[PDB]
Amino acid sequence: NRIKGIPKLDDANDAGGRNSTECTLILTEGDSAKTLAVSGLGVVGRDKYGVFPLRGKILNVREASHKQIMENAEINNIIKIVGLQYKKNYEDEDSLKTLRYGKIMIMTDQDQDGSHIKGLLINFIHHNWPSLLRHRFLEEFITPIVKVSKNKQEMAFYSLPEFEEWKSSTPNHKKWKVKYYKGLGTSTSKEAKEYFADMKRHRIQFKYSGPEDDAAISLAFSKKQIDDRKEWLTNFMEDRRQRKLLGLPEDYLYGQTTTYLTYNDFINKELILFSNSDNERSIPSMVDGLKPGQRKVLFTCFKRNDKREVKVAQLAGSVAEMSSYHHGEMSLMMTIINLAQNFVGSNNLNLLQPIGQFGTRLHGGKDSASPRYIFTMLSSLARLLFPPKDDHTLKFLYDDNQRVEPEWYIPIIPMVLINGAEGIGTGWSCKIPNFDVREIVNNIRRLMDGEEPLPMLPSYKNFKGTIEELAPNQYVISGEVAILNSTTIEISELPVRTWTQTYKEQVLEPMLNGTEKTPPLITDYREYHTDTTVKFVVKMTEEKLAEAERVGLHKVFKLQTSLTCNSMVLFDHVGCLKKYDTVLDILRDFFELRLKYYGLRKEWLLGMLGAESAKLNNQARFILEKIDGKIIIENKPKKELIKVLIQRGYDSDPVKAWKETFNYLLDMPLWYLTKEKKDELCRLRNEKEQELDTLKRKSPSDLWKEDLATFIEELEAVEAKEKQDEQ
Template identity: 65%
Template sequence: MTLQAKNFGSKCTVSEKFLGQVGKSGLVEQVLTWAKFKAQTLLEKAGGGKKSKKLRGIPKLDDANDAGSKNSLSCTLILTEGDSAKALAVSGLGVVGRDKYGVFPLRGKLLNVREATHKQILENAEINNLIKIVGLKYKMKYETREDLETLRYGKIMIMTDQDQDGSHIKGLLVNFIHHNWPSLIKMPFLEVFITPIVKATKRNQELSFYSIPEFDEWRSTTHDHHTYRIKYYKGLGTSTSKEAKEYFSNMDRHKIKFKYSGPECDQHIIMAFSKKCVDQRKEWLTNWMVERKRRKELGMAEEYLYTKDTKQISFKDFINKELVLFSNMDNERSIPSAVDGLKPGQRKVLFTCLKRNDKREIKVAQLAGSVAEHSAYHHGEQSLQSTIINLAQNYVGTNNINLLQPIGQFGTRLQGGKDAASPRYIFTMLSPLARLIFHPHDDPLLRYQKEDNQRIEPVWYIPVIPMVLVNGADGIGTGWMTKIANYNPRELIECLKEMIDGKEPSINLRPWYKNFRGETESVGGDRFVVSGEIAVLGEDKVEITELPVGTWTHHYKESVLEPMLSGNEKTKAPPVITDFKEYHTDTTVKFVITLTKDKLYEAEKMGLHKFFKLQSMISTTSMCAFDQDGCLIKFDNVKQILKNFFTLRMEYYGKRKAYLEGMLQAEADKLSAQARFIMEKCDGRLTIENKKKIKMIEELKNRGYPSDPVKVWKKKQIEKGNMDEEEQTPAEQEAEREEPTQSDLDYDYLLGMTMWTLTLERKEELINKKNNKVQELEDLRLKSPGDLWTDDMKAIVEKLDEVEEKERAEEAQSGSITKKGKGLSALAKGGKKGLDSAPSAHGRRVVPEIGDDLKKKVETLIRAKERKAEGGAPGKRGKKKKENGEGGEEDGEPGSEGKEKKARAPAKKREKGAKKSPKKKRNFSGSESEDDFNSSGSDVEFSSPPVQAEKRLPRRSAAANVKFTFDSDEGSEEDWKEVKSRSKPDTDDDASLSDSSPAVKKKTPAKPVQEVEKFTDSEDDLTHNKNDVANNKNDNDKLFDSLLGSGDDKPMNISSDEDDPPPAPKAKPVKAPKEKKAPKEKKTPAPKKRPAKKKADSESGSDDDMFGSKAKKPAKKKKKNDSDDSGSDMDDPASPSPPPRSAGGRARKPTKYTMDDEDESDY
């Protein structure tokens, strides 16, 4: 049994019943026990050795003088967050001395060891250094004082920033100790050193706050808080050396001890960091958000952990009151608001742009600095620059309405935005649509936040249309994730108009992407198939003029067409096309592909969209967003989001109307008083010259002049809570600190007028302004809130038409085509260049088709989901979770919208493509998006986005490939799971077609190249690891890594081989001379053919093989360890592979069993 399973020469598909019996036999437990023992042995070897006084080879360690000596129990190791924090701690050691205190800086966030493999732990230098410094040993149980005396340090003091990320680092360190040495949690071993996060200073008085909720409570209860100077301490590096000495001088105030209060502490730590506690973590966060909302409604302050008298905290309180702030902030960073569709960083950018109101363009790098200045942004500017670029992008698959203008190279569909220029070289400014969508009349009604004693961006904006649906959303947080597609703004506006009229929206909304010329069709169950455009040009040519949304041009060429052209060396798949040419631009797509007549016939029979991977899938089952109260909500369908937005927006139109009426009345009163003042002054009835200010104010009061009507009205609105206080300039704040206002009367609006206002012209101008204000007020009173909304939407549509017409004119001028169809009229100015990139006029368009089998599969998944919601169906496999405790919640009920197919007039201009045969009339497989498949069983994912694939927990080798199976009769949604991002498709098409063609036909052509992967609108998801081949190495090791999991948690389920479809029926005959030549031969094979037997030898996916990886040669010739091979059999499914050699012939050579150290490590 030295061969890997995929090289056995055959495949055994076992049933669920058999797997159940194996699970009950105890064999699985024995294997897991042995694997854990093996892993534990390796870990123990890497643990701290004999207690030593001096350590060498650990960089940046400042060891305590008594560490490792007989006094080591009284020594404390200070773990800091970065080098700057270490410098602060070293400054403080000047007060307490260096004998008992050592300092070691951490490089960011520690590994979550509860979900890490033993290999990851062994290779993590920081964890290994920490174990050596403290002198910990994996096999030890530290339960007594004598046990603690074996350590080099008797305590660990965690000294991180007081922000939410610092809280996360504290939690990861607690998790590290609890997972490996749970007995240490019960000992007085862990401490934290807290520093102020905010300081408020007024003259000689200084107040320190150790948490944001504590500062918010003080600010809400202190009426003169604005007279204090507020300083936000983002990190420990903000504190000076003088302050560091003050902190260490008052050690009792800043040192907080952790205490173990019982088993609930263990439960809370596991809940916060174990991937198996997905549902508990989601419930924990939901309950916290509900409680926060309730406290706000009752006018109560948020709970916080550190008070003046706090000396110790329990682990339970730390998780519930401090770590929860990080988890919630993680969600707020990743998941947008359903009100304005923005995440905090995006909202800060928009706030700064609206505040600056630039009429000229500004560099992206400069704007990022301005955002940090105006909105109290406390993180790195690099991520802010990326946010600005994303807001301005407008190529296919990004924003339907970009709020910023892309002036320069902001990225294209060629590389999905990765080709954007440096922020130093590109410019931007507000889009002309931005101020129509975020109307200035709504600004006074928003609830603005305050930080560093300055007013920053509001909690959310209230746009005229639901931008969360216009531009979509994508993000993964803690306990929750979201995936919202883009929708047509004009259709949304029509729906809103119907709702204003009291009707139900009649339009069946479906995902829509600006300038996308393909088709989007519903397949039921809130899933939509997105198809590119392909046409047949002749007997041996086809042209591709559109790719699925989120499939970028260069990546498609590299991952699909090039393997089709040159064949696949790893799978020995021959070429299936003879040539392709590129005619696309940065905004259009055009591949002209040449292939043989036979291949074209077979491709049409299979379906050209399927053959060339021109279909992907979008799911609408994972639509989560924050509501207006800051609570996360999962929306079942698009219209639910629309109705939620409509209710709030209509309420704010009522508030806007009331505000405008009051403001217009106050402004009219102010103009009337100014006009009266000028007339009385000109007539000589009012004399103010040569009088003291107090006398002048007294005379104006006696004559019945009101105090500034506008300020008086605003003050009343603030007192009623209808609007926030207006922001003061720094000069006004300073003046108020020095000399508070004594009088409530404000006549500056009269006495501050210039002498020019005494002229006849200015007097008449003031009277006209007053009359205009009165007329404007009367017109407003005649309108309803719905009328105001309708007017705003009309203005948006008009400006949108204008902007898009301008864009089309620029595209036509440069020879680009943005309309679906032939578009010859647009090429008049483009010349030959335009014709090259345009769809061919004589092409026969192939209409994309969706197979009935896929629709049935979707229905099966819906039924399975409903059964699971009702309590679970028997025999259903457990749902896999993802790493870092970030898994998913179950889907809500599917929405009902989007089930009708819209007629697309331009699409009918070409002839329909050849229809598929009944056997082959099967929809593509493997091209559904990750969120679609993941969310079919889980709409709340505790997983990393595709860009973070390198952090995934090791699973079976096939987990690194995109694999969709439709041959299983089981309704589990696991069959729909996709574990890789769209940047590199790794799916073998054979797997998905096996059951559609049960009879093997000798003339069946080789299978097509790999599928185009899923789409996602998040640019972050585009960064994909292209070394998937290398990542599948040492599969044996990965298997046991995944089996290990956590010692405290349940063992993982062992999945069956049924994840893979039967490969044999998919075997395609290849011409014999080709087989006998070198495997890498790319030339056209000789006409002689031979049947394909035992396809499973090379086609059996690594999904079936739990211990093996791809072997490049037949097993009987293989001498070296299989696990050393760099690839798996799924490494490059993009090209068809020749059949394996027949098993007939001479007897098999006796098997040699070689067990060396490397083999053992694989187990």
């Protein structure tokens, strides 16, 4: 038996015929993986091993429409390759002997998405044929995530925690050469043959040992066990949190050569990791409202003062480098474009400037130009909102061995609620609308003043239509429509997230030329739009128009978008995921944290100015001794210098200690060691002490006011400029 449908199958010469139950199918993610397996099969052979590449994220068959399952080419391909039959139940040897292959070995990069791909496969097979899992039908081939070699002494690590542990355990680091393998494409064909040489260390057969697996699998992919996953993940986050505090290491898989892994083990030990990571990359943080990647871009932009405009692609490059971002430059540029966008319904306050074409309301930012043709920059408001001073309090992460972005940035206003937040993870989702900046300021000012905050209603920059609140967390958005004549009507605005094109297609054209079931509603329509505004003109029949009116134009022309924010799930500064029942809830938490961090900033300010005036004190003494002739140790032997210093009592350069030593002293008279200079210097030290005095006068809740004032003045400027430009 030979398959002749799909050319991408390098079937096992023996598979299909006799002994087929002893042939395995390597399923690989991507084509290159397939090729790597092939490079590997030069060792084990081509009779008992076939190779086939998976496209990407396999379908979730557990809860998918029969149509979707059928239309799905890949699943069909797999069935065709293995000789599976949905209807047939494989509980018997005859059923087994039917299959063209004996086992299926899945190989994916030692990356969490990989765990996800494995999962989806297991879910597939499980949903479609419970019995097979028991039979030891599925196998996993694993390749090291990291390699450390030194002097022809190679050490391979298949877990990041395992490697971290090796580093924690063993000294003399910085001696070994370390290289990361973030994708099967990274390891050479040699390395591949080598892998396949040590087969036992890379082969992990999946063992069904009890019913827990059936539950565990369903826990992972059943579309009715969301809450189960919410708990399942909250547990994870919690155990993790507790492990962190205690300073305990976390347990890792694949530590040594382990023969088999239970489906339950896989799910709860490996798959859950992915899920949490998905969450971490999908759902933003209440503090900055930014997802890691966005935060990496922003951090990057901050890292370079970069006053001149920069080519997006280039910036993306530098970001990939500086921000130690590992998920490619495409997503990154996309992220940058997202950050820079400022069309109606997108961002109320864009941090990055769109110097060129970054997509319009026509196509929902999709119509944007090539990253290599467009330029960006930080907007003036950007650093105002993220004070240059605050980042002394931010905890910066050193993952990948390199200093990168913090865990969150501390904005003077809650950014989450001004640019909203949209995310899809595992067991969780996020939807937060935009809110007017002024109102935010006001409520922060109001709350700071010592008064309860005013209720806030979703606001979208440059949006003309109206937003009503039918209920708590339930709103309805309506675009503007005017009745010109009994023969003509005018659509001035559309609801948010309604794109001119999408509308033209989905709503108008169908009304223009009615479908088999219903007749046309309109006779013709003209459109005089722009990139920034919309304007349809629809001609109808006086009757049909009358009926439309009687029913409601906003309802007829689907100019009313309703949305309920019952999902507002965000990350706590501690890193835990909380779901916010109100906007004000968030606003409160933010206010609190921000205030505190103003406190800390103050402390930091006290630190600097103190180290300064103190350095000026130790500087001050030397001049007095020399001027006052109470100490003449100039040019005296260097040891005598130190000795006298330690005995004189005065401390060493304060600033170095503060950041965490005789340089200030070392500095020679240099034709400036006059008393009068002391007269100049005294002003400098006294000025430090005084600045501090004014600083002490300022309360944490008071500097905030300044920050806000500055922001607003700039803001007003910006808006003016923009409005004029529009004109």
